Structure 1
Amino acid sequence: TIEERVKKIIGEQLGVKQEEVTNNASFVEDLGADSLDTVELVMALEEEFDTEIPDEEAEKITTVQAAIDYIN
C-alpha cells in the first residue's frame, strides 16, 4: 500500500531490507544514518510524496513510525 512507499524508500535509502526497519527503532543511531544520511532520507521521502516538510517538522521523524505518521 501507500506505506510500502515509505517502508520501501527508507530501506532503499539506508541499505536495509524492508523487514529490518522496526517501527520502534530510531534512524539516527539504530539505522546508522548520520546527519547527511538523515537529511538525504527525509528529502527522498518528501520528493517521493512530492509534499513539503519544513526542516523543523523533519526534526521529529527520527523514529521509524513517525515517517508514516506525518505522511498519513
Structure 2
Amino acid sequence: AKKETIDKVSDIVKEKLALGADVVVTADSEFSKLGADSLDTVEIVMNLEEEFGINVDEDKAQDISTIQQAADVIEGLLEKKA
C-alpha cells in the first residue's frame, strides 16, 4: 500500500476520537482490537469508502488487518473504483 493511502486511512481512525495532534501514527497500529468487538467498523469502512470514494463491502471491511493491510485493500478498490 502506498504511503499516501496509509496516511489517509490512519487519519480516518484518528478523526474518530479527534487525534493526530500529539499522538504518533503507525501503519502497524492495529485499529481493530476489542475483546468484546464493541468497536464500530461500519463507521470506519464508511469513512474510508467515502473519502477515497470507492465501493467496498462489509465482508471486505470486516476482517481487515492493521492499517498496513487496510491501505493495501483500499488501493485495489481505487484502481477501478467499481
Return the TM-score normalized by structure 2: 0.60
- Equivalent in 7, 10, 22 of residue 26 of structure 2: 22
Q: Give 1:40 shift.
A: 0.3
Computed over aligned residues only, the root mean square deviation of the Cα atoms, in angstroms, reads 2.7
Q: Give 1:62 shift.
A: 4.0
Q: Give 1:16 shift.
A: 3.1
Alignment check: 8 A CA contact 1:21 1:64 kept: no
In structure 1, stretches of 5+ residues that fail to align are: none
In structure 2, stretches of 5+ residues that fail to align are: 76-82
- Once the two structures are superposed, residues 8-66 of structure 1 have per-residue CA deviations (whole angstroms, 9 ceiling, x without a partner) of 22222243327534222322227xx8332x22011110011111111111112242212
Distance 1:67 1:14, change over 3 A: farther
Distance 1:27 1:5, change over 3 A: closer
Q: 2:72 & 2:17 partners in 1: Cα distance?
A: 19
Paired residue secondary structure (1:35): coil
Q: Give the corresponding residue for 2:4.
A: 2
Structure 1 or 2: larger helix share? 1
Rg bigger for which structure?
2
Return the TM-score normalized by structure 1: 0.66
2:42 is the counterpart of 1:51: no
Comparing both chains, which one has the higher relative contact order based on Cα–Cα distances under 8 Å and sequence gaps of 6 or more? 2
